[PDB]
Structures are given as C-alpha cells and as structure tokens.
Write an enzyme that holds these catalytic residues in place. Structure first.
Site, PDB file in Angstrom:
ATOM      1  N   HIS A  21     -44.011 -27.921  22.886  1.00 16.27           N
ATOM      2  CA  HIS A  21     -43.665 -27.519  24.241  1.00 16.27           C
ATOM      3  C   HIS A  21     -44.501 -28.254  25.294  1.00 16.27           C
ATOM      4  CE1 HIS A  21     -43.004 -25.349  27.931  1.00 16.27           C
ATOM      5  NE2 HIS A  21     -44.322 -25.267  28.013  1.00 16.27           N
ATOM      6  N   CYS A  42     -37.743 -24.989  31.017  1.00 15.63           N
ATOM      7  CA  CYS A  42     -38.017 -26.024  30.031  1.00 15.63           C
ATOM      8  C   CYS A  42     -36.878 -26.227  29.053  1.00 15.63           C
ATOM      9  CB  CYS A  42     -39.289 -25.685  29.262  1.00 15.63           C
ATOM     10  SG  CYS A  42     -39.741 -26.930  28.037  1.00 15.63           S
ATOM     11  N   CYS A  78     -37.093 -27.824  26.156  1.00 13.68           N
ATOM     12  CA  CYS A  78     -37.560 -28.197  24.824  1.00 13.68           C
ATOM     13  C   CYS A  78     -37.024 -27.271  23.721  1.00 13.68           C
ATOM     14  CB  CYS A  78     -39.089 -28.295  24.785  1.00 13.68           C
ATOM     15  SG  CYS A  78     -39.997 -26.782  24.341  1.00 13.68           S
ATOM     16  N   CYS A 109     -38.582 -23.714  23.585  1.00 15.83           N
ATOM     17  CA  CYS A 109     -38.110 -22.772  24.596  1.00 15.83           C
ATOM     18  C   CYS A 109     -36.652 -22.370  24.386  1.00 15.83           C
ATOM     19  CB  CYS A 109     -38.354 -23.329  26.000  1.00 15.83           C
ATOM     20  SG  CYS A 109     -40.134 -23.427  26.382  1.00 15.83           S
ATOM     21  N   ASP A 136     -52.543 -41.278  29.972  1.00 14.08           N
ATOM     22  CA  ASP A 136     -52.729 -40.681  28.653  1.00 14.08           C
ATOM     23  C   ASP A 136     -53.749 -39.578  28.803  1.00 14.08           C
ATOM     24  OD1 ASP A 136     -55.103 -42.795  28.698  1.00 14.08           O
ATOM     25  OD2 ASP A 136     -55.579 -41.327  27.131  1.00 14.08           O
ATOM     26  N   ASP A 187     -56.628 -48.067  22.890  1.00 11.92           N
ATOM     27  CA  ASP A 187     -57.874 -48.268  23.623  1.00 11.92           C
ATOM     28  C   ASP A 187     -58.790 -49.157  22.778  1.00 11.92           C
ATOM     29  OD1 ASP A 187     -59.743 -48.214  25.594  1.00 11.92           O
ATOM     30  OD2 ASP A 187     -60.129 -46.053  25.531  1.00 11.92           O
TER      31      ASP A 187
HETATM   32  N1  2YV Z   1     -61.703 -48.475  27.519  1.00 13.39           N
HETATM   33  C1  2YV Z   1     -61.861 -47.433  28.376  1.00 13.39           C
HETATM   34  N2  2YV Z   1     -61.383 -46.214  28.037  1.00 13.39           N
HETATM   35  C2  2YV Z   1     -61.539 -45.140  28.854  1.00 13.39           C
HETATM   36  C3  2YV Z   1     -61.084 -43.880  28.472  1.00 13.39           C
HETATM   37  C4  2YV Z   1     -61.250 -42.794  29.329  1.00 13.39           C
HETATM   38  N3  2YV Z   1     -60.920 -41.485  29.199  1.00 13.39           N
HETATM   39  C5  2YV Z   1     -61.339 -40.923  30.344  1.00 13.39           C
HETATM   40  N4  2YV Z   1     -61.193 -39.613  30.638  1.00 13.39           N
HETATM   41  C6  2YV Z   1     -60.952 -38.597  29.626  1.00 13.39           C
HETATM   42  C7  2YV Z   1     -61.339 -37.228  30.188  1.00 13.39           C
HETATM   43  C8  2YV Z   1     -60.877 -36.049  29.359  1.00 13.39           C
HETATM   44  C9  2YV Z   1     -61.652 -35.580  28.303  1.00 13.39           C
HETATM   45  C10 2YV Z   1     -61.220 -34.485  27.557  1.00 13.39           C
HETATM   46  C11 2YV Z   1     -60.020 -33.855  27.873  1.00 13.39           C
HETATM   47  C12 2YV Z   1     -59.249 -34.319  28.933  1.00 13.39           C
HETATM   48  C13 2YV Z   1     -59.680 -35.411  29.676  1.00 13.39           C
HETATM   49  N5  2YV Z   1     -61.924 -41.766  31.203  1.00 13.39           N
HETATM   50  C14 2YV Z   1     -61.884 -42.967  30.567  1.00 13.39           C
HETATM   51  C15 2YV Z   1     -62.336 -44.226  30.939  1.00 13.39           C
HETATM   52  C16 2YV Z   1     -62.169 -45.303  30.080  1.00 13.39           C
HETATM   53  C17 2YV Z   1     -62.660 -46.651  30.445  1.00 13.39           C
HETATM   54  O1  2YV Z   1     -63.235 -46.863  31.533  1.00 13.39           O
HETATM   55  N6  2YV Z   1     -62.485 -47.648  29.561  1.00 13.39           N
HETATM   56 ZN    ZN Z   2     -40.613 -25.680  26.281  1.00 15.55          ZN
END
Ligand code: 2YV
Ligand code: ZN
Ligand code: 2YV
Ligand code: CL
Ligand code: CL
Ligand code: ZN
EC number: 2.4.2.29
Lengths: 369, 369
Positions: free
Chosen positions: A335, A304, A306, A309, A266, A92
């Site tokens: 896991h 699973c 893995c 498991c 991701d 990123d």
């Molecule tokens: N460059 C860029 N990177 C991002 C990373 C992100 N990550 C998210 N969501 C993450 C939400 C989240 C937080 C904690 C635990 C689980 C999921 N939205 C996101 C949006 C962007 C974006 O618009 N531009």
């Molecule tokens: Zn497993």
C-alpha cells in the site's frame, strides 16, 4: 531502445514532467524509486513492485559489495537476473553508506578504506562494482559532507568530490560495455553554501553527465533549510538533464522538491514505515496499530487504487501488525509504495495539465488538516 | 452447492481419492490444509495459497478466540471476509491448543478453564466460537490424551471426549444456520490402545458425524507407532465418510497415512520450516542456508511447477534467508506449500490410476536416497 534519452513534455514554473528512455524501460518523471538495498524491495516480489507503478528501483554498491558480493552477482548473471527485476536499476555509489554504516573508516584522496572484514572504495572500484552489478544508472563516487559544516570544511569536501567525479567519469568511459548501455550521474555537493553549490555545479557540467543529483541534503538540516538550498541549487544544474534528490523523502518533501525542479527521488520511508505500522493516506499518515482501527472496516485509504485497499480492511491489517505477522508487513508495504506511486502520478498529470500549483495547495491542505 | 457431500471416485487397498463438495468450494481428497492459525497462512496472501492448489485451510478456535476475538470477527463479517479467503475453512476446536499453549489449565467435566487473561472452553462454547468464525468444517471439542498414557488414564480421557462429542453434536444441531451450512467432524481418541480406539469409534458412529478425525497422534510417538495405531484405527471409522489425521505431517508420514486410509491432513511443517530455511524437494529436504547453495543457479526443486521455481535461483533465496529478508520467507513458504500440494496431486492421480503402491515406492526410494 536508446541508452539514455530524457525528454521534457511539460513544465510549470520550475517543475517538469517527462520521460527517461533506457534500454530496460521507460522512466516517467517525476519518479519515485523504491529502495532495494539487499537486492530486494523489502517484503515485495518484483512483480508487486511493478504493479504499484514503479518504473525503476534503487540498489546500493555498499551493501551488495559486502553481501552477496559484486563478482558473485556478476557470476550469477547480474543484479537484474539475480533478483528478478528486469527494468532499470539505479545504484548509489557507496560514498554515503560507507560513512553511515561502517564501524571504522579511513578517508584519503584515493578513496575510503573501511571495516564491514576490511574493504576499500574509490571512484574506480565503485564504478567497477556497479558495472559488475549491471546497474543502468551509475552514480559517481562522492563524499556526503556532514551537517553542519564550516564553509572551509564544506569547500575542501566538495572539491574532493569533484575530483572523484572526474575519476568516476573516466572509469565509466573506459568500460565500453558500461558506456554503451548505462548512464552516469554526477553528484553536486557544497553543503548549504550557495557559492560552493555553484562551484560544484560548474565542475560537474564541465565534466558532463547524463543526470545530476543534489547530494548532501536530507542529512538532518530540516525541510525549511533543504528547500532554501534547493531554491538556489537546482537552477545551477543543466536544465536539459534529470535532477535527482538523494534520500528524499516524505510526501510533502517530494511535492516541494518538484516545485523546485527535482525529477527523481528515493527513500526508505514507505517500506520501512510500512513494516512499522505507519500507512500513508491522503489525510496524512496513520498508525495502524492504534486501537481505534481494531474494528474499522474501511481500507487503509479511501481513494487508493492499490490491491490492498481493494481487498482488506484496516481492522485486518491492524490485527496482522499487532500479531507480528509477515503478511502485515507485506500489505502495509505494498500500500505505501502504491501510495507513493499514485502521488507521483498525480504530480505528473497535474504538471502536464498546468495545474500543479493547485494540486500542491490542495494536497497540503488535506494532508495536514 | 451442497452443504457437505463426500464421494469416493477410486480406491487402491485402503487408499481412497475423491471429493468433498461444500457451499464454498470443492475439496479434492486426499487433501492437505495449510495452517492459518492467526487468520493468515504465514507470509502468503490468500490468492497465493490458492495458486499453490490449496482447496481448504485450517484455522484455530484457541488462537482466534484470544486474538482478535470471536465476537469481533463475527462483527467484522466472519473469518472468510476478515482474512480474504472465500473457500472452505476447517477450524480445530481448541481442545489440543489449550493444553499445549496455556500457562495454567483446570480440566473438569464441564470443560477447560485457562489463562491466555482467564478464559473457558467447553463443547458448547467451542461450537459457538466456530459458529461466530463462520467455519465450514467444525471440529468437536475433545481432549488430546498425553503420550504415553496408562490404559486406564487413556480410557477415562477418551470417555470424557466421547461425552464431549455428544455435547458438540447437540450444540451444533441447535444452531440452525450452522447445521444447514457447515459440517461437524468427530475426533477418535484412545491413545495407542486398540480396544479404546474401537470403543471411541463406536461412540462416534453412534452419534453420527460428517467426518471422523483420528486424534491423539503426532504427539511424540514416532512414525512406526503412529502407523501401527493407524493400521487398526482407521478401519474402525465409517468407510463412507472422510478420515482426517490431525497434525500430520512430513511428506513420508502423509504417504503412509494415505496407504492406511486417511483423506485429510494439516501441518505447520511446510510454512514453519520454510521460514527457517528448509525447502522440500523430491530428493528430500534441503537447508537453503547451507553455503553449498550460494552460487547454485538451479531452482529449489528441479521438477516443481511453482512460481518460485519458475523464476528464482537457490543462490538468490540463500542470500535472502541469510539476510533475514521477508521475501526469503515468502518464497520458501510458497514453494513448500506448492510442493505439498503437488505431493497431494500425485497421490490423487496415482490412486485414480491404480498405481499408488508404485508411487509410494518410487517416492520413498528417491526422497530418502
Ligand atoms: N552518494 C550519495 N548518496 C546519498 C544518499 C543520501 N540519503 C540521504 N538521506 C536519507 C535520509 C533518510 C534516512 C532514513 C529514513 C529516511 C530518510 N541523503 C543522502 C545524500 C547522499 C549523497 O550526498 N551522496
Ligand atoms: Zn492502498
Ligand atoms: N482437537 C484436536 N487437535 C489435535 C491437533 C493435533 N496436532 C497434532 N500434532 C502436531 C505435531 C506437530 C507439531 C509441530 C510441528 C509439526 C507437527 N496432534 C494433534 C492431535 C489433536 C487432537 O487429538 N485433537
Ligand atoms: Cl526499507
Ligand atoms: Cl506456520
Ligand atoms: Zn517450487
């Protein structure tokens, strides 16, 4: 091995399955990328990350530029050598993390200045940091529009991101070694607004990228709204390039996003929630700390494949997590990442076989029973 | 496979090298036992513990009787199955840990009552707990005399331990399955006093055990004094049975103790100090957190054969430990346990070849340079 070649092997509705070939390896799509923010996928050796089925992992410009530093990592041989992961890495660009984690920020047309120590990020600096890291997939430097936003604020934000996307493209293309060996993805913005998403998609396609991320989602809008935006946003992106939904997500989020044309994902959920005692199973998540697991000899999940498991019981892992033992975090994380990879494999196979709709239905009925 | 067979293959001075054959595996001596107090060797899968060269690990009656509980572990199939270690396990009897870790204790001829929840330990209960765990080497229930102690206090303490040793012997022998499949070690006490150590050795030999531990050391007396006591204490034990020095120790402590006739060791140092950033090397310990390692591409130790030293740099591990990353604890611990096992291997080989005296000299000159 090619620099970057995306091939779609099969489709079902908006869903696609295929491969991205890169110099450091093949990425099977739809793909899930474990997150390795501090140059480690938390609690896992890279060999274990690979053993779970991961083809590619995610790193972060923001975290690594602060610690241990981009020039330092380059001096040490690059991120791949440093952490011992020899396959593709997507990084990123810092655009989201700078606004999420920095104490003080100043935003301008040039970029963002911030306090970790005072630092700056701009399209040019972001691309250079990712070059120093040796990233295989480089993200354009963007602005993640806060949610909710007025149409006018979303518009001005998206427009800046598009100008930054062109600057990212130019900086990447100016660095011969990067342009020859890595790929560059653009990031669509526009909040929840169809016209802005369209303008953003048009701008990115005009510039031209190797892949296209849907940015500005998973920012508190909820699944219904995220799906609504994906419904119109993904078809705006070039069909022949990968589509990457940043920061998503829960298993059901992934399935629904694939139904809407997303190829890459991701999320920190499997790793973070693993450390916290939440294990993913085909019958939904469980919290292994719950007393009901104290004498349960079954594995975390009954199907699973893995290593965790195959060998250890819920009862043992319950004990480890209750005790605050590092091995508990290790086993839960392995896991959960393996579960995510098996989900992606089931998605790929079902699309290949033209039975993804049925899979999605069967998955949901059982997961939410 | 025999229940318990100790064979001495070679000697040099007081040092011995050989093997203990047991039903679950062979133990090469002199042996180092990684500590697995909460049914895990901290931050390592059992396969990794084995890969470092460990033949046997240590567990604890005190910790396991409290969490997750001895009857619970037996219901789940025993300690070996529970934690996934199928080789021999030695369990301490609780006699030391109860006095070290309990908030309130009441000592009597019957045993020790304590608060973790109120519990009791006695020779009979300790042996039964170790039976429930499925321990391969069972320790007699003893009293570790505090240091320093007056001769009279050391005498009364040691005498109680000897009465408890006979009760341990009887409880073990009464349990047919335990007596047929496990071994029982007695523990010599007597503080720093030669006459008391002799009386203790005589009492234990009269009862008869499969092996003999030197107890009551590594309790704050320092290396010079510990070595002085070992000088006269070890020769008092039966020559034809293993000699186990409880809770020792640093690499130099181990070498000196082997020179004095010790065959078995356990210590939390490699695991605990690993998590804290201290790595063992042939040139002495280093603290990987030190800034001098931030760009050091060398492995932790230049000769070490472990997986960590084959793949990762000091610079990377420095970054992990500074960042508080779990992988840092994993890698440091694996290296340190591997270092300890390589030390034991060098000790065994040098005794076998009649060059242990030279090894000890060479080891010290370099380690303390
Ligand atoms: N460059 C860029 N990177 C991002 C990373 C992100 N990550 C998210 N969501 C993450 C939400 C989240 C937080 C904690 C635990 C689980 C999921 N939205 C996101 C949006 C962007 C974006 O618009 N531009
Ligand atoms: Zn497993
Ligand atoms: N049953 C029994 N168990 C023991 C365990 C011990 N452990 C030690 N030393 C440990 C010292 C230590 C503490 C922290 C870090 C490293 C080393 N001395 C010990 C003595 C005894 C003993 O006399 N009887
Ligand atoms: Cl995480
Ligand atoms: Cl430890
Ligand atoms: Zn090593």
């Amino acid at each position: 091995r090619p620099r970057f070649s995306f091939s779609i092997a099969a489709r079902e509705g908006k869903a696609r399955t295929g491969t991205i070939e890169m110099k450091r390896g093949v990425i099977r799509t739809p793909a899930f990328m474990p997150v390795g923010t501090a140059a480690t996928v938390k609690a896992l050796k890279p060999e274990t990350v690979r053993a779970t089925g991961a083809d590619i992992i995610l790193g972060n410009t923001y975290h690594l530029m602060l610690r241990p530093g981009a020039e330092r990592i380059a001096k040490l041989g690059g991120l791949h050598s440093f952490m011992g992961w020899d396959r593709p890495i997507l990084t990123d660009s810092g655009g989201y993390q700078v606004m999420s984690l920095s104490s003080l920020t100043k935003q301008s047309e040039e970029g963002v200045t911030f306090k970790s120590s005072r630092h700056m990020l701009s399209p040019e600096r972001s691309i250079e940091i990712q070059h120093l890291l040796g990233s295989d997939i480089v993200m354009a430097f963007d602005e993640c529009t806060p949610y909710p936003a007025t149409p006018s604020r979303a518009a001005s934000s998206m427009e800046r991101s598009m100008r930054w996307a062109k600057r990212s493209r130019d900086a990447f293309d100016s660095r011969k070694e990067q342009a020859e060996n890595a790929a560059l993805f653009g990031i669509q913005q526009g909040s929840v607004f169809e016209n802005l998403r369209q303008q953003s998609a048009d701008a990115l396609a005009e510039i031209g990228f190797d892949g296209y991320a849907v940015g500005g989602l998973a920012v508190g809008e909820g699944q219904d709204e995220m799906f609504r935006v994906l419904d119109f946003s993904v078809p705006m992106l070039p069909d022949d390039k990968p589509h990457y939904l940043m920061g998503v997500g829960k298993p059901d989020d992934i399935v629904g996003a694939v139904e809407r044309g997303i190829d890459m994902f991701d999320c920190v959920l499997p790793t973070r929630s693993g450390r916290n005692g939440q294990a993913f199973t085909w019958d939904g998540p469980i919290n292994i700390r719950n007393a009901r697991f104290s004498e349960d000899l079954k594995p975390l999940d009954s199907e699973c494949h893995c290593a965790v498991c195959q060998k250890w019981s819920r009862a043992y892992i319950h004990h480890l997590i209750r005790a605050g033992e590092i091995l508990g975090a290790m086993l839960m994380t392995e896991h959960n990442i393996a579960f995510y990879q098996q989900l992606m494999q089931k998605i790929r196979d079902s699309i290949s076989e033209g039975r993804f709709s049925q899979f999605a239905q069967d998955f949901r009925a059982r997961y939410f029973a």
